[PDB]
Amino acid sequence: SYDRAITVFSPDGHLFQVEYAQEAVKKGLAAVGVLGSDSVVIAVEKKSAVKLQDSRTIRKIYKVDANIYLAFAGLSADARVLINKAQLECQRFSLNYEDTMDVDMLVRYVAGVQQKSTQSGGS
Amino acid sequence: WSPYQDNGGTTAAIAGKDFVILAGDTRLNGDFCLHSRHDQSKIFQLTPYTYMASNGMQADRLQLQQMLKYRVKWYKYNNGGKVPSTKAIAQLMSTMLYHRRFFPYYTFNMVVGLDEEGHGVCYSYDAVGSTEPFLYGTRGSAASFVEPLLDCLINRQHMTSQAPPEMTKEETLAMLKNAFTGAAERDIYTGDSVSFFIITKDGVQQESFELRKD
Amino acid sequence: SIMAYSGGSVMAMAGKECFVIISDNRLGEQLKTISTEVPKLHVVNDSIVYGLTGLRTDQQTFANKVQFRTEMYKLREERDITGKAFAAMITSMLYEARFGPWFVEPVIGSIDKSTGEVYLCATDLIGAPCEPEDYVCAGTAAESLHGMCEALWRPGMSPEELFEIAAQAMLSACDRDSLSGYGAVAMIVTKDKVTTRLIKGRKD
Amino acid sequence: TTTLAFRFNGGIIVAVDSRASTGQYIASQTVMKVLEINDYLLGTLAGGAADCQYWERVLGMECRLWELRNGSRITVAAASKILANITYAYRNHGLSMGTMVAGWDQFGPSLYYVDDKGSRVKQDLFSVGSGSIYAYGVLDTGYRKDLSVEDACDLARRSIFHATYRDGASGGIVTVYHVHEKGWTKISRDDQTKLYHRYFP
Amino acid sequence: TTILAVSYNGGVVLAADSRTSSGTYVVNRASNKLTKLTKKIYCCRSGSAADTQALAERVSNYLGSYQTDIGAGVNVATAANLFQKMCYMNRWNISAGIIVAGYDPINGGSVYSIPSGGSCVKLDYALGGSGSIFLYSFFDANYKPGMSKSECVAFCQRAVAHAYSRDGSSGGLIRTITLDADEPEDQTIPWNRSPYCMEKDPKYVTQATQNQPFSSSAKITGNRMSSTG
Amino acid sequence: TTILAVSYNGGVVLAADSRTSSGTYVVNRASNKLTKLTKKIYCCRSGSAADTQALAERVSNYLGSYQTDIGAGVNVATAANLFQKMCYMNRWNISAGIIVAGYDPINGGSVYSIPSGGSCVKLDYALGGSGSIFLYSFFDANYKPGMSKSECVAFCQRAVAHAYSRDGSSGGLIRTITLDADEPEDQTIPWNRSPYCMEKDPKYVTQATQNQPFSSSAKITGNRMSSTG
Amino acid sequence: ASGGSVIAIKYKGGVLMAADTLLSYGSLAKWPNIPRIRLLGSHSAVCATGSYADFQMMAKQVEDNIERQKMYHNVDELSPSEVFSYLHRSIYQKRCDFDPCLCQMVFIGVRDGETFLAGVDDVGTRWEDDCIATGYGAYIALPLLRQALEKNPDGLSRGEAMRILTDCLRVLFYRECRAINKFQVADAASDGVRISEPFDVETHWEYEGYCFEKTAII
Amino acid sequence: MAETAIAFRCKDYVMVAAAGLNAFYYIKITDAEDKITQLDTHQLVACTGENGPRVNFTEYIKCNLALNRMRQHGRHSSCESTANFMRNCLASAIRSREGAYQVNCLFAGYDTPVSEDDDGVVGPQLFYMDYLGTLQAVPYGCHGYGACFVTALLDRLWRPDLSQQEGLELMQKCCDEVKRRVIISNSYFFVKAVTKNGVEVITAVH
Amino acid sequence: TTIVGVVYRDGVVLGADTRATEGSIVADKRCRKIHYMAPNIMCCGAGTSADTEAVTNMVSSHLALHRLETGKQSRVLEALTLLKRHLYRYQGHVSAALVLGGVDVEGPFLATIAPHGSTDRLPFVTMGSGSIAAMAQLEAAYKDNMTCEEAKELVASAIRKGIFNDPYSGTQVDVCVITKDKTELTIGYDKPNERMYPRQEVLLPPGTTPVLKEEIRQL
Numbered sequence A: 001s002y003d004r005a006i007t008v009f010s011p012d013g014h015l016f017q018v019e020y021a022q023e024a025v026k027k028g029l030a031a032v033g034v035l036g037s038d039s040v041v042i043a044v045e046k047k048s049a050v051k052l053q054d055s056r057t058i059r060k061i062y063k064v065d066a067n068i069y070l071a072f073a074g075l076s077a078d079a080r081v082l083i084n085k086a087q088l089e090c091q092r093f094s095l096n097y098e099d100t101m102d103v104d105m106l107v108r109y110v111a112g113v114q115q116k117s118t119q120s121g122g123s
Numbered sequence B: 001w002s003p004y005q006d007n008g009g010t011t012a013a014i015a016g017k018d019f020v021i022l023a024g025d026t027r028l029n030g031d032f033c034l035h036s037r038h039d040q041s042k043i044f045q046l047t048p049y050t051y052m053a054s055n056g057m058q059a060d061r062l063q064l065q066q067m068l069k070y071r072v073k074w075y076k077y078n079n080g081g082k083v084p085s086t087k088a089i090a091q092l093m094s095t096m097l098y099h100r101r102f103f104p105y106y107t108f109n110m111v112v113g114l115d116e117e118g119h120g121v122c123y124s125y126d127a128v129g130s131t132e133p134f135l136y137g138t139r140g141s142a143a144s145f146v147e148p149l150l151d152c153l154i155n156r157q158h159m160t161s162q163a164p165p166e167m168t169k170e171e172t173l174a175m176l177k178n179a180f181t182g183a184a185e186r187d188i189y190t191g192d193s194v195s196f197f198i199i200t201k202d203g204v205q206q207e208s209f210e211l212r213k214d
Numbered sequence C: 001s002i003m004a005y006s007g008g009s010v011m012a013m014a015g016k017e018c019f020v021i022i023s024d025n026r027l028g029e030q031l032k033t034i035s036t037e038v039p040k041l042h043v044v045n046d047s048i049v050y051g052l053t054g055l056r057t058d059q060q061t062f063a064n065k066v067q068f069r070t071e072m073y074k075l076r077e078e079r080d081i082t083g084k085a086f087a088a089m090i091t092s093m094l095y096e097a098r099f100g101p102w103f104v105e106p107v108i109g110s111i112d113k114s115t116g117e118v119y120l121c122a123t124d125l126i127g128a129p130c131e132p133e134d135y136v137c138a139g140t141a142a143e144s145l146h147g148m149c150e151a152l153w154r155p156g157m158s159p160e161e162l163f164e165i166a167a168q169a170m171l172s173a174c175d176r177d178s179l180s181g182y183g184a185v186a187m188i189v190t191k192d193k194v195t196t197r198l199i200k201g202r203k204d
Numbered sequence D: 001t002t003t004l005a006f007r008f009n010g011g012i013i014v015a016v017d018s019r020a021s022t023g024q025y026i027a028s029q030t031v032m033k034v035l036e037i038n039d040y041l042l043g044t045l046a047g048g049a050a051d052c053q054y055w056e057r058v059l060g061m062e063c064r065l066w067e068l069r070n071g072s073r074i075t076v077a078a079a080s081k082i083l084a085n086i087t088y089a090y091r092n093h094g095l096s097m098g099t100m101v102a103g104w105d106q107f108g109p110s111l112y113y114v115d116d117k118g119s120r121v122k123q124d125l126f127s128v129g130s131g132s133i134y135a136y137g138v139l140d141t142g143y144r145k146d147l148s149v150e151d152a153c154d155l156a157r158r159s160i161f162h163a164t165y166r167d168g169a170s171g172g173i174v175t176v177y178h179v180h181e182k183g184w185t186k187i188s189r190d191d192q193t194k195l196y197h198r199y200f201p
Numbered sequence E, F: 001t002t003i004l005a006v007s008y009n010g011g012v013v014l015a016a017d018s019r020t021s022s023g024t025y026v027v028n029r030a031s032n033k034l035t036k037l038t039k040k041i042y043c044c045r046s047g048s049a050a051d052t053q054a055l056a057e058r059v060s061n062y063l064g065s066y067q068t069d070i071g072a073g074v075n076v077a078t079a080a081n082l083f084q085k086m087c088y089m090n091r092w093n094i095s096a097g098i099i100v101a102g103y104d105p106i107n108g109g110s111v112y113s114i115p116s117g118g119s120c121v122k123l124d125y126a127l128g129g130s131g132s133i134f135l136y137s138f139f140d141a142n143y144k145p146g147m148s149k150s151e152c153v154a155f156c157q158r159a160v161a162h163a164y165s166r167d168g169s170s171g172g173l174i175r176t177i178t179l180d181a182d183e184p185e186d187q188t189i190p191w192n193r194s195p196y197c198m199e200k201d202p203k204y205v206t207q208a209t210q211n212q213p214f215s216s217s218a219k220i221t222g223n224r225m226s227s228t229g
Numbered sequence G: 001a002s003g004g005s006v007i008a009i010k011y012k013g014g015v016l017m018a019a020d021t022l023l024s025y026g027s028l029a030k031w032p033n034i035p036r037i038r039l040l041g042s043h044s045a046v047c048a049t050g051s052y053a054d055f056q057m058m059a060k061q062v063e064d065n066i067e068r069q070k071m072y073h074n075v076d077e078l079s080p081s082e083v084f085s086y087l088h089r090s091i092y093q094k095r096c097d098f099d100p101c102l103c104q105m106v107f108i109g110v111r112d113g114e115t116f117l118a119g120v121d122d123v124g125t126r127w128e129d130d131c132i133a134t135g136y137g138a139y140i141a142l143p144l145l146r147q148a149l150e151k152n153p154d155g156l157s158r159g160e161a162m163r164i165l166t167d168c169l170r171v172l173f174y175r176e177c178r179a180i181n182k183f184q185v186a187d188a189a190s191d192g193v194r195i196s197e198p199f200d201v202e203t204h205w206e207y208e209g210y211c212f213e214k215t216a217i218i
Numbered sequence H: 001m002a003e004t005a006i007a008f009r010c011k012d013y014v015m016v017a018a019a020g021l022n023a024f025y026y027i028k029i030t031d032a033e034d035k036i037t038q039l040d041t042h043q044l045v046a047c048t049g050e051n052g053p054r055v056n057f058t059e060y061i062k063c064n065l066a067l068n069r070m071r072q073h074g075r076h077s078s079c080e081s082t083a084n085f086m087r088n089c090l091a092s093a094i095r096s097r098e099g100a101y102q103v104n105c106l107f108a109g110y111d112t113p114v115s116e117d118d119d120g121v122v123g124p125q126l127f128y129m130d131y132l133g134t135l136q137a138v139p140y141g142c143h144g145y146g147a148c149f150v151t152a153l154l155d156r157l158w159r160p161d162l163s164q165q166e167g168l169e170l171m172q173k174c175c176d177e178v179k180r181r182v183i184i185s186n187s188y189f190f191v192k193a194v195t196k197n198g199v200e201v202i203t204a205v206h
Numbered sequence I: 001t002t003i004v005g006v007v008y009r010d011g012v013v014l015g016a017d018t019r020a021t022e023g024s025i026v027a028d029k030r031c032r033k034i035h036y037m038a039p040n041i042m043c044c045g046a047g048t049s050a051d052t053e054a055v056t057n058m059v060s061s062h063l064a065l066h067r068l069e070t071g072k073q074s075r076v077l078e079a080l081t082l083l084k085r086h087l088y089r090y091q092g093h094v095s096a097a098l099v100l101g102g103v104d105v106e107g108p109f110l111a112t113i114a115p116h117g118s119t120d121r122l123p124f125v126t127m128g129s130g131s132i133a134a135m136a137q138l139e140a141a142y143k144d145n146m147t148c149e150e151a152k153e154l155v156a157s158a159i160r161k162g163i164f165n166d167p168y169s170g171t172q173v174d175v176c177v178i179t180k181d182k183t184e185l186t187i188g189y190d191k192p193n194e195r196m197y198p199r200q201e202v203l204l205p206p207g208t209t210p211v212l213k214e215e216i217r218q219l
């Protein structure tokens, strides 16, 4: 199939397709999360009060696990595909290990998918 | 046509304090005939300190001796010339017998070598790789003759008497000749001549011995 | 198999003017111990002692027909049965039932009271006569006993030192057999006396 | 092979034999029936000798790789689920292994049992092997939850012994472990023939 | 099926019967077991009627694709190594006894017998089929090598006729063809003009005296052909 | 085993090989398959060596007890109904092909072939054994009825020699005997004076060119007999 | 098509190997005029007991291996100990593919003094001796070959090793069913392998206990 | 084998117990069927097996002991003479037309001196048997699926000097183990005992 | 088993081995396989020790019982007829291969009996498992009218082809010469396998095995 190398190195040791992917996030909606003693809050931008959006309220922060939730920033079509990989990984974990997945485990999987798309042909 | 065939013979080893004596008779035989009397393909050298001594089927013996031969060479190339120990080879043996579990070898194996401390330890295997470190071991057709004999004179059990001192290389060798002269009398698939290997830290010396020709 | 259903090994060695015979103490049903204090030996007179192995139903039925025939031999002929006549008698019993065969393997040891010659005999289940001059052995651990007896025997043994070889041969072979063990009962016998010894063994 | 382990107020005690027989011939008498997986888990072996020593070495590799990646210890509920998914995947491949895992995770103890067919059960009291049926009746008579550490070591050493005495496939050297909160310790290691002249002098 | 191929000085003479029979019933009594590979190389064909037909037209397409790319004539040893390659790598799945005989300008007349085992043997004459076991002692006595073309035709027609007289599997017509430097000449003689048959063999005319009349003596006087006498 | 019996004007000529073979090994290479029943009636003997020996000496004791009570000579048809009675009521337990041939003053020379099925057929010539299937096409071509005694002996010796040349079961000596109004004359010719063998057959002298030299052409030039050339 | 028994022996200076020129099919002896002794390269020769189609494809493979290694590169020809080793690893590969080379083989070879004599089975067994026999010559002819190597440990000459093969081929004609009296003998020496013209042995059938009246069952 | 028989002998009594379950491949027909047949006034046998051969073997044994008391003027034979008569019927049936009896049984009895000249056995008798014809005098014998649970229980707790009540609470432990581990529902166990005064049907342990 | 026989100038010579194995292990090393039938008839035997001994003793007592009636020397053809009718009426279930040799008023009689009941009267016969290896020695060195010494050495050199090549045979050569007048039976004629490396003889002192009870019964 098509597997030409896209993410290559610059003559200054930079990855152009990664530095240009970060610019697509810097135009995305701002999302802020802080860490407390007994609670975690995360707040997103929720583009506008369009008045044409559905009266059924549409959540931006997506549910990934029973206790682990996710908020993103960037292309909203790429993030949906990324979360359905992570929502598929939680059901791989509690089918092979009988345990609730830790927070640090799910982030090492999603960061493993982000890095895997930076070292593939055609991707 | 059946792809399995027992080729007789027996191998026995007794390990001492800084040595192992390793023996195996030279006799190849088939369906009802006698193929040869001088097969040296029963005990194989892997490293200068560790041998393998297998018997059963002669065809799958030579294949297992070569796949053991090159996994030692990939060990020696990838570790900067470091020769593998007996414990490393005998766990390599125990895994490869299980990787072919559903079309297995008709071999019965013994990995025989010295420790990192210098003491000799023999291992034994079933057809699928059940390992155990032990001080002796006897495989082959005459195993049920010799393995109870080595229980009675090495362990020193059921005898209300004080323990003898440690066995030398010579008193172990003269003991092990009494088993192969005992297996040549009562086992029809065993015995033309038995070859003794004496594995010491200053190289290996090699002897031969004559059994009954019938 | 039917032959190794009950367990138990009986052997005998020949000495200078004596012989030994020794059985184990186990009765079983293929893995489980039924009894731990059951010998396999039988004594018919002061010269002949024989031991049965194989299926325990046949070990008791055949030994009733032997005692039916040995005591009828003593009523007809006014004399004790001899070793060559007893061994050739129950050789014929295992051959009459050749197609419905008994599952015993009798190990006969005997001696002449006046001459002093030992006579060993171990038939098969179909009655194959075989008299070695050195030793005989049958049972489930029989393949382990041909290694122990042949590497330790010599023709000129005293009765006290022949017992020490037969006892170390039975126990070292029963430590490798999972259908025989639990001690051993031996019987050394000369021209002058019969001595019956019970031997320590592993209770495994 | 006779192998039992039970759960009580104070931890888990594992007790085994040391005998491996190929039908009516005894192959060995010093077989380590307990493969320690790491310094807080245990695993026993029953059935096929190579099928157990392979996949509990595979299980000891997946537990070590857990600690490397996630930085913490593996639980026992995750350790058996590794062994049960391996076992259920090869249920038609003729494997013969029956293994108990025992350990102290952060939720106390747990004592499981895995078949060669993919089962996994959670109790406080097992006895596995061919001579297990002898080890139940002497153990179910004298078991209670609040035993002491010394009496439960005595009940385990005595319940293995009455199975080795009766079964032809069990025997040798009775090995007793104790799984407390800091790990496991080898309590005793003694011959079955020496143990007969203690219990019936 | 009785097939054979015999060499003379010029070329070869192929000979075969004509009968495919499903066990005990004659499905076809005018079969053609002489299969054309190229113009001067044929093969005899015994065994399974489907397994040997699929081999014969798979070899004949490799062999004609070879002849076009070469631009010359095909040797007989070339065609006999395409049956040996296929009858050996299918030897557990097919039932195929093939006799390959032909003519090439280099080696003259060649005969290759390829049995069911898949071996290849170059011969002077070959035999094949279930009816061939009658013809070994017939060729040991009555066959002399070095016959002409007209003598090998009348011999191989007389050879097949002794084979299907005793064999139940074989019968029907006798199809022969000669392959040499001339054009291939074929000939099919029927059953009623066959050179041998046991029904007109004058030593099988007298019936075996089985059905004796009820008589007073042990003197055997022939069968009983009437109810009165 | 190849056995046969051929009738001429005076009496009969019995002919047989000499080899009992346990499957693939020659247990005996000097067997005698020509069994005496009475002075002028013999039987050929194929199949099981024990099952046919027990029949042949059970018939021969009924047949000599009959001859004493009668006080005359035994007919051949009498001896052939004692084999048919025994080979039929034991046909599932024995393996017995018997050819009974003899001489009596009433009927002259008689030949009875009793196969493994247990039937009885009176013939002019009979064939039997595993090597007999080679001799049907040999007797269809080379046999003419009405030969003399000296011609039937040299024919039946030439007949058996073609049979055990191809058959692996048969071989060894050739034992023949003639049964007519004179004394029974027996003759045993060896292998090295046999009238036929394939090793001295001059058309099997040239080896089949299998082991070709490694060459530049397709011209077949015979086997390779040396490492240099 | 199937071959019969093959016998071989070493002498002082080379190796001899004999085999009948017969190719039977069950009991039927189809062709008494085919050669079974194939010679390999310039120093060695092999012959088989068993299926002929398996031998004809195997020896075609190992003859192509000797020449193409020698033709393409500037290397020496393979020794007999190295082409027998390729012959052994090719038969063992076929039984692991569940399609073996169903025949015993006898291999001879002499390369400048070093004589080589070994056999190989369909399974993969290989052995080296001073006397190899396969088929029913391993039962019949091989006991006669073994006593004549131990009645003189210095070695057999060519003249006395040819007497005992003829003594062994004579008993193979007596006691094997699927055999004829037409034998070829290969002779591998320092000059190379040389196959002889087919001969026969002198058989004795004239014992006085073989007569018609003694062996009769009346 | 689905139903267990448990018997142990002591200094002056022999306990027996046999579960009264009768089934049809999974369906409980009964729960109280007596499977301990009273042969003599001091002898009984606890046969296990299916109900076909079990009645027909015990009725042949019981009617022949009674016949041997008719023809011998009411003289009760010993327990070894009854046990050796039993295994003669097992051993002669495995080599017959009709086939082997599929009964596993435990013979129990008490030997009393029948006259002043009798100097035989005084103590209790307990014999293990089999369907083939094995006979073994044993301190305690067990059959069924739950036999191996309770034979190693009696390895732990049986003593030769147990009293009538101490062996009664031992048999209660023997019955509660079979209810605990065996999948086969054995709920009623029919405990009987043989003493110097004859047989007695113990009501307490069930 | 490697039983053989050879007809020489005046009489026959019978040969046998001594090894008897029960299932791949050597039961007896000095078994006797040349049996007694008559003062002029001996009989080698192969197969099962039960079936060989019990077909031989029944016929040899029947030949003795038939000798008191006739008062004459027993034929070897009547020894053969009693053997072949027994082995036929059990249809090969009595697994005994026999070699029968004897001398009568009609000369030496050597013949073999198969376990199915067939008989073959030959100058030299071999039976048993090593019969194939022993026949090849006889086919290479037999000739008519050999002396007593050349036939006794041909027989003994044919047993050793079954000793050193057949695993079911060995340890000795038994040779029995049958003449018209006498009969000579040697057992230790050829012992090619001696005892190499005699036994170390591990000494155990009397009393080192632990004994729990002992009971001595004087006679």
Ligand SMILES: Cc1nc(C)c(C(=O)Nc2ccc(F)c(-c3nc4ncc(-c5ncccc5C)cn4n3)c2)o1
Pocket: D001, D021, D022, D023, D024, D046, D047, D048, D096, D097, D098, D113, D115, D116, D126, D127, D128, D129, D130, D131, D132, D133, D169
């Ligand atoms: C929770 C639980 N409750 C029970 C009662 C069990 C249990 O028994 N589980 C189990 C699972 C798999 C096995 F494979 C085994 C097992 N153990 C054995 N020991 C010895 C021999 C043997 N040895 C020598 C010779 C012949 C044989 C047959 C065979 N096996 N098979 C046992 O689990």
Ligand SMILES: *[B]([O])([O])[C]([C][C]([C])[C])[N]C(=O)[C]([C]C1=[C][C]=[C][C]=[C]1)[N]C(=O)C1=[C]N=[C][C]=N1
Pocket: B125, B126, B130, D001, D002, D019, D020, D021, D022, D023, D027, D028, D031, D033, D045, D046, D047, D048, D049, D050, D052, D096, D129, D130, D169
């Ligand atoms: B115990 O008897 O189950 C024991 C446990 C094992 C961990 C040593 N197993 C064995 O002894 C098995 C018995 C067996 C069970 C099922 C199928 C086949 C065999 N024996 C072996 O696996 C064996 C074989 N050869 C050598 C050593 N062990």
Ligand SMILES: *[B]([O])([O])[C]([C][C]([C])[C])[N]C(=O)[C]([C]C1=[C][C]=[C][C]=[C]1)[N]C(=O)C1=[C]N=[C][C]=N1
Pocket: E001, E002, E019, E020, E021, E022, E023, E027, E031, E033, E045, E046, E047, E048, E049, E050, E052, E095, E129, E130, E169, E170
């Ligand atoms: B000849 O009889 O062998 C013939 C050769 C064929 C290649 C033309 N074969 C058949 O007649 C076979 C049957 C057969 C007989 C004997 C040996 C092997 C095969 N005929 C068929 O295969 C057949 C049967 N029914 C329908 C179509 N074809």
Ligand SMILES: *[B]([O])([O])[C]([C][C]([C])[C])[N]C(=O)[C]([C]C1=[C][C]=[C][C]=[C]1)[N]C(=O)C1=[C]N=[C][C]=N1
Pocket: F001, F002, F019, F020, F021, F022, F023, F027, F031, F033, F045, F046, F047, F048, F049, F050, F052, F095, F129, F130, F169, F170, I114, I118
């Ligand atoms: B002849 O080969 O058929 C021959 C005829 C016999 C009556 C003298 N039969 C045998 O050779 C038989 C084997 C056989 C071959 C072919 C078909 C049927 C039978 N020989 C034996 O029965 C035999 C074998 N071993 C020992 C003794 N006898």
Ligand SMILES: *[B]([O])([O])[C]([C][C]([C])[C])[N]C(=O)[C]([C]C1=[C][C]=[C][C]=[C]1)[N]C(=O)C1=[C]N=[C][C]=N1
Pocket: C124, C128, C129, C130, I001, I002, I017, I018, I019, I020, I021, I022, I023, I027, I028, I031, I033, I045, I046, I047, I048, I049, I050, I052, I128, I129, I168, I169
């Ligand atoms: B022959 O191998 O020396 C011998 C024949 C003789 C002892 C009657 N045969 C045996 O050794 C037989 C076994 C056998 C082997 C091969 C073919 C047929 C039979 N042995 C016994 O019958 C035997 C068994 N146990 C004790 C004594 N003899």
